[PDB]
């Protein structure tokens, strides 16, 4: 069993404690048009509810956020379809929740912790002289649908409220979707569209990853739940945008289950056929899932996946604890044995009593679920 504190990674301690906390929440009306600034050195895709850690040092970026605190506190994170030609049709708003200004080495620096809020549709990208871009965006509403049976049942059967759990779920299907007999589809088909059902199917995989998971930590709402899960699936950029376009929590859960089931092996994106790890080696060392976004000392965001065993990897150099994202663990650079692609790191415990004693931190940009 694991004795590492799963809460520790989510707090980004490497970013330093003693940060100015902000409580106040900003939310834009559905379908409403907004003009939000864009951070020039952010190239990651942010899912709503996801924590984005930043370390900004470029004067124009520092001034941008410094001014952003004085107002809205929200910026735009673009989901690039082509990161080279900087093309994006969708994105997510990031609201700063923790902030800290420092001054060192002749420069003014700022460290932030933001959270994904609202998905948007890009309407136009205007550029300012300082390098910071502004984005005319249209807020995409979250589409909540009622029970599949809500409409068809306007009757007496309405007042029938929702191992060995197996029989409860069968009694649940038989009861909740009894009025399917009035329709042209079976109860087993309506289950494939039931939020509670689809969630319990995902919760099954989440528990295979976090063996010490307590259901109280998981969000009750399928809106918050679908998004939490979306942000921890090690998938390619093309599939991630497709997931971000999804408006329904049901369509999202159904999608995530397809990804979770069809998934088997995770290879090196560069040489494509070199297998690095498998679905069975994935595990949650953080409460926000097996995969999460972290910043290196130069502000580059690495979305890293925690796995117990990795295969064609070569380590170089000696372990380091500097800027470690998992306190108590030391990192050592890992590259693909075949091509030399930087795959992530090997994390090793600094104390004999720690569990896991070793794991692998793989960046999703290096992986390909092919």
């Amino acid at each position: 069993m694991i004795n590492f504190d799963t809460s520790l990674p989510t707090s980004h301690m490497y970013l330093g404690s003693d940060m100015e906390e902000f409580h106040g929440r900003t939310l834009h009306d559905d379908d409403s048009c907004q003009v939000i600034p864009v951070l020039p050195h952010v190239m990651v895709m942010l899912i709503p509810g996801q924590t984005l850690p930043l370390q900004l040092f470029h004067p124009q970026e520092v001034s941008m956020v410094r001014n952003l605190i004085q107002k809205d506190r929200t910026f735009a994170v673009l989901a690039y379809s082509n990161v080279r030609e900087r093309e994006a049709h969708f994105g997510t708003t990031a609201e700063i929740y923790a902030y800290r200004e420092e001054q060192e080495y002749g420069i003014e620096t700022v460290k932030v912790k933001a959270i994904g809020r609202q998905r948007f549709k890009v309407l136009e990208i205007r550029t300012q002289s300082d390098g910071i871009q502004q984005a005319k965006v249209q807020i995409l509403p979250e589409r909540v649908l009622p029970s599949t049976m809500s409409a068809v049942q306007l009757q007496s059967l309405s007042r029938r409220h929702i191992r060995a759990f197996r029989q409860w779920w069968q009694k649940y299907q038989k009861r909740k979707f009894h009025c399917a007999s009035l329709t042209s589809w079976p109860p087993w088909l309506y289950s494939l569209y039931d939020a509670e059902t689809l969630m319990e199917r995902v919760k099954r995989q989440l528990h295979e990853w976090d063996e010490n998971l307590k259901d109280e930590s998981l969000p009750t709402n399928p809106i918050d739940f679908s998004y939490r899960v979306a942000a921890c699936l090690p998938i390619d950029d093309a599939l991630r945008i497709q997931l971000l376009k999804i408006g329904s929590a049901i369509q999202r859960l159904r999608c995530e289950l397809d990804i979770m089931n069809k998934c088997t092996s995770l290879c090196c994106k560069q040489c494509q056929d070199t297998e690095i790890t498998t679905k069975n080696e994935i595990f949650s060392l953080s409460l926000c899932g097996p995969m999460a976004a972290y910043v290196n000392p130069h502000g580059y965001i690495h979305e890293t996946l925690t796995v117990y065993k990795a295969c064609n990897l070569n380590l170089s150099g000696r372990p380091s604890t500097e800027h470690s994202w998992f306190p108590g663990y030391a990192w050592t650079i890992a590259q693909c044995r075949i091509c030399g692609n930087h795959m992530g790191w090997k994390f090793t415990a600094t104390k004999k009593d720690m569990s896991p004693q070793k794991f692998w931190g793989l960046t999703r940009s290096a992986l390909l679920p092919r």
Binding site: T148, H161, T183, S191
Partner: protein
């Protein structure tokens, strides 16, 4: 695209029913809710008295009667699904009946989540308030003009059921609620003066884990009766009484009713149709009924069973059990088509005449329903007598009340038939002539008989049969036209008319006149409270083409209508429908004119023309179910009846009828003698209504239906529930269609507690008998069914798409596509193709099979080796539930409205994604309208229509039609129940048994009718005063947008029903081009002909 939607058949299913004194405080009333309809009745004790039927602009959710303090009768509260609240009072003054709104308002909250256990509408016993549970965590209160409402923060979020407690100083509500600890019953006191809740009279007593309903019991008992799965408990503070009867374990109790007003007996009903008696605690099983949605005790012993899954009932609760042991006996059955889960249009009987065969009901109430437009005749005798020119019934015995003689007329001859019970025999009536053609004969005044021939008027006595009197024209001329009642005779001799009176042994000539032109037709039917003596004579004339109302005996002209044309009036008739007097006049071209007639003045008003046939129409009056009707004999035989003081014309299902008369004999009672070109047929008439419904009970669930012409039979997918027996299999619950098959078969496996058993039924298109039943594999769920020809093969195959369903599996991993051939009265399995998923849909795609396997869409080629071969695949990322096609254009559908259009490239042999749309909402049905449009059913009982230079424009579909139907459509079908202004015809079947029709309109015709709708809504008074625009507004829990690209046919059709000055108001300045009321009458009439 602009569409038109009209109701072919109103909803049949019962949503709710109540008893009280709504009309008068004397009459016991039964109010039935059929969704958008309200049927009001009086308990006849010897039947059911239909008083009024009112339509509403909403779906009924709540319906409960109440009498607040001093009132002449009862006030009715109704709450719609769109949260329209209203109090209705009954108002009657003579033949005029009107429902009156007392208070109205919309109770919907700006925010809040609609509760899981539905809308709960309770009323305080002292009529102090209205309690509404629409949203969880709030309790809305309406103290019973604008229906003022307020909320109270209800701490317990999950409320199962709630009722207002009887006999309380301060109003109290008792509710069953569930929390993570368990399910407990609680009490709260509702204060009006403080607008808040305060602690209830008794403690939160713990109830059953599956406690479902609260039954508020009146004084001297008080408190509540909580009903669960296994237990029935009673709570009254310190008073407790817990019972667990085994008889209620099989099925959950879903409905109840109060039998004794004090609260000593209660009716209980389960999901399996069992009826129980809760005596005050003891429970006794009474018997079996239809699966009751609602129950109502009325009068003594009689009970109303309101069924939504099957036919509604009237049953008698006898004090003594029969031989079988049932205290329940079925009295009357009421046709319910709902739910329509699938249907098809088939030209059964006659080609061009479409019939609609549906998969109706569920479980033991499962049936097939055949819906055919027109009234039918039930033949009891058929005789070869060609060229009949007339039919008249007679009573040869004055002592007898029944007809025993039938008199036939032929070219220059007369034959007489006698009815010796069921035996028809050729005879000769003494006094009557056989060598002359008869124009009239019948029983007349002073126990006599008359016979008007081309030569004379003959009067014959009945004891004995002999000629007592005879009348002739003075110059021995021939009688041209003739009319006769019981006391009077009016005969025409070219232009001349003669008025005679039937006296004892005398035919007295009273008066005579000369007409302006030749006489074409005559009528002297006595109308109103006239004791067989008519003061009026109706006459049609040649050359001038005029319908004239003449006074008797003077022959004075009272009215003269100029019918217009070169076509002479052939038949004329004075009649009475629903106490209103009318004049009917039929022309030689098959055209019928119908006016209202004033008995005193003679004035013909409200001229209406209706085209019946191609041949001259003959009008004969007949009696059916103690109601006067008119049979219109032509190549399109028609019954002319009255419905809401407006004349209705329903067709008869007969090739042609030339002449007819009503025959009431000892052998043929309350019958109709009909004559065509070759034969005379004696028979009984069906129900005088627009549509006819034949019921084929299956006693199991019908799911899918298709038709094979080459086999003269239907393919029906059905399922039956079987229980797990103490053996290696399962046993049936009752005999059903799939068990009682003529020839049976089972699937042979080749692939690797209540059970659902699936079957492919074979039913004959005439007899409707199960010729064959093919039982599917264990755990095999049959989904799709199609009867077509594939590839080069000339044999039609019944193809079924299945799914292997297991509890552990979420999405089926296996499935089959089974090809069957129906030959020699037995299904022969041709091909068995195993697929890696569920076969939700299948469609014949230009000689190929297009079938869905979960997310994938497959195209199969039918080889000479007689086995399907995989051609091309399309992987969609969305479940292929819906699969519709037209040419090389394919529609792929999801339950969440995710539609994507595919195109098969013949030379490439691959699928191309034309367009896509992803806007989440629940979708129940979809159909392709044309090359560029498609129709569908959306969440919250709505209908929609989607249409088709730049790629980012062409690859996207646009929502052109939005309409709130108020119904849940399960099936769309191309076809018509009828034998141009509009384009196409798509029928639709709903959960409530409602059938509808969707047709296309032109851009300007849409605007004309839309403008008309806005004007009609200013004239028409809405029940409960709901705005039509609001009712039709595309509604979801999120958005409510006004209806677009759709015309409410039901509303448009009520223009022909409004008063003539109100029609003038609607058409005034309507229109640019000007529009006459006469122009708009023709347009609206033309639209009624589509259904």
């Amino acid at each position: 695209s602009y569409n038109y939607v009209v109701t072919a058949q109103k909803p049949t299913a019962v949503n709710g029913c109540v008893t009280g004194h709504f009309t008068s405080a004397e009459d016991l009333n039964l109010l039935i809710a059929k969704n958008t309809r309200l049927e009001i009745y009086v308990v006849t004790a010897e039947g059911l008295r239909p008083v009024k039927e009112v339509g509403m602009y909403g779906k009924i959710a709540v319906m409960e009667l109440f009498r607040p303090k001093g009132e002449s009768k009862d006030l009715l509260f109704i709450l719609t699904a769109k949260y329209n609240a209203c109090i209705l009072e009954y108002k009657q003054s003579g033949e005029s009946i009107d429902i009156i709104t007392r208070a109205h308002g919309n109770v919907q909250d700006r925010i809040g989540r609609p509760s899981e256990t539905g809308i709960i509408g309770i009323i305080d016993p002292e009529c102090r308030m209205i309690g509404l549970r629409l949203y969880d965590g709030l309790f809305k209160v309406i103290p019973l003009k604008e229906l003022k409402a307020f909320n109270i923060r209800l701490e317990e979020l999950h409320v199962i059921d709630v009722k207002f407690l009887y006999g309380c100083q301060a109003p109290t509500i008792c509710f069953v609620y569930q929390d993570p600890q368990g399910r407990h019953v609680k009490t709260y006191e509702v204060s009006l003066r403080e607008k808040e809740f305060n602690k209830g009279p008794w403690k939160q007593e713990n109830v059953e884990a599956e406690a479902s309903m609260v039954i508020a019991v009146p004084e001297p008992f008080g408190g509540a009766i909580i009903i669960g799965q296994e237990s029935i408990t009673y709570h009254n503070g310190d008073k407790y009484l817990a019972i667990a009867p085994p008889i209620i374990k099989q099925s959950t109790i879903v409905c109840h009713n109060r039998v004794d007003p004090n609260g000593s007996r209660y009716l209980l009903g389960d999901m399996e149709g069992r009826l129980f008696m809760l005596l005050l605690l003891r429970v006794e099983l009474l018997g079996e009924t239809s699966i009751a949605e609602c129950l109502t005790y009325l009068d003594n012993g009689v009970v109303f069973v309101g069924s939504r899954l099957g036919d509604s009932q009237l049953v008698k609760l006898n004090v003594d059990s029969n031989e079988q042991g049932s205290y329940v006996v079925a009295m009357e059955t009421f046709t319910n088509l709902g739910p329509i889960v699938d249907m098809c249009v088939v030209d059964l009987e006659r080609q061009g005449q479409g019939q609609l065969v549906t998969c109706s009901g569920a479980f033991k109430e499962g049936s097939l329903r055949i819906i055919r437009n027109g009234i039918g005749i039930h033949e009891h005798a058929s005789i070869d007598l060609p060229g009949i020119k007339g039919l008249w019934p007679l009573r040869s015995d004055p002592n007898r009340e029944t007809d025993d003689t039938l008199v036939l007329s032929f070219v220059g001859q007369t034959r007489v038939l006698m009815l010796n019970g069921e035996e028809v025999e050729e005879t000769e009536l003494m006094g009557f002539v056989d060598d002359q053609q008869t124009f009239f004969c019948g029983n007349v005044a002073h126990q006599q008989l008359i016979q008007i021939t081309s030569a004379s008027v003959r009067l014959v006595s009945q004891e004995p049969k002999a000629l007592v009197s005879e009348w002739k024209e003075p110059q021995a001329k021939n009688i041209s036209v003739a009319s006769c009642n019981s006391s009077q005779v009016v005969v025409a001799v070219g232009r001349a008319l003669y008025y005679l009176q039937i006296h004892p042994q005398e035919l007295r000539q009273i008066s005579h006149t000369e007409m302006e032109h030749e006489v074409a037709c005559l009528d002297i039917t006595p109308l109103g409270d006239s004791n067989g003596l008519s003061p009026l004579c109706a006459i049609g004339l040649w050359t001038d083409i005029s319908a004239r109302i003449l006074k008797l005996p003077s022959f004075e002209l009272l009215h003269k209508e100029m019918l217009g044309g070169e076509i002479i009036p052939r038949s004329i008739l004075m009649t009475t429908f629903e106490s209103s007097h009318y004049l009917l006049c039929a022309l030689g071209d098959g055209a019928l004119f119908y006016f209202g007639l004033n008995i005193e003045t003679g004035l013909l008003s409200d001229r209406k023309k209706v085209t019946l046939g191609t041949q001259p129409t003959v009008l004969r009056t007949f009696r059916s179910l103690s109601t006067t009707n008119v049979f219109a004999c032509s190549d399109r035989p028609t019954v002319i009846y009255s419905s809401n003081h407006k004349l209705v014309f329903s067709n008869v299902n007969l090739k042609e009828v030339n002449y007819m008369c009503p025959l009431n004999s000892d052998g043929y009672p309350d019958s109709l003698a009909l004559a065509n070109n070759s034969t005379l047929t004696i028979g009984t008439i069906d129900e005088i209504q627009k549509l006819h419904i034949r019921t084929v009970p299956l006693y199991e669930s019908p799911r899918k239906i298709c038709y094979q012409e080459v086999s003269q039979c239907f393919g029906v997918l059905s399922s039956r529930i079987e229980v797990q027996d103490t053996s290696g299999g399962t046993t049936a619950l009752r005999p059903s269609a799939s068990t009682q098959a003529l020839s049976s078969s089972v699937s042979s496996s080749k692939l690797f507690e209540e059970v659902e058993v699936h079957n492919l039924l074979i039913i004959d298109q005439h007899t409707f008998e199960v010729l064959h039943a093919h039982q599917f594999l264990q755990n095999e769920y049959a989904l799709s069914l199609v009867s077509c020809k594939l590839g080069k093969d000339p044999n039609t195959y019944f193809i079924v798409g299945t799914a292997m369903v297991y509890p552990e599996e979420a999405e089926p991993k296996q499935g089959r596509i089974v090809v069957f051939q129906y030959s020699d009265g037995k299904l022969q399995t041709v091909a068995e193709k195993e697929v890696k998923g569920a076969v939700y849909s299948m469609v014949e795609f230009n000689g190929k099979l297009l079938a869905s396997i979960n997310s994938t869409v497959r195209l199969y080629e039918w080889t000479t080796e007689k086995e399907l071969r995989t051609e091309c695949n399309h992987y969609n990322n969305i479940m292929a539930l819906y699969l519709k096609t037209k040419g090389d254009f394919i529609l792929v559908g999801d339950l969440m409205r995710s539609v994507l259009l595919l195109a098969y490239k013949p030379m490439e042999g691959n699928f191309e994604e034309i367009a896509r749309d992803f806007n989440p909402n629940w979708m129940s049905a979809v159909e392709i309208l044309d090359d560029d449009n498609f129709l569908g059913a959306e969440n919250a009982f709505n209908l929609f229509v989607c249409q088709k230079t730049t790629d980012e424009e062409r690859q996207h579909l646009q929502e052109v039609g939005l309409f709130h139907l108020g119904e849940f459509v399960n099936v769309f079908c191309h076809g018509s129940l009828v034998m141009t202004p509009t384009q196409g015809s798509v029928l639709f079947g709903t959960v409530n048994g409602m059938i509808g029709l969707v047709t296309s309109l032109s851009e300007s015709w849409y605007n004309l009718l839309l403008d008309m709708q806005n004007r009609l809504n200013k004239v028409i008074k809405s029940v409960g005063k709901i705005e039509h625009s609001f009712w039709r507004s595309f509604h979801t829990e999120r958005k409510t947008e006004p209806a677009t690209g759709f015309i409410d046919g039901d509303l448009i059709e009520s223009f022909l029903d409004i008063s003539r000055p109100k029609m003038q108001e609607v058409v005034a300045n309507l229109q640019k081009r000007e529009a006459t009321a006469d122009d708009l009458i023709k347009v609206v009439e033309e639209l009624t002909r589509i259904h």
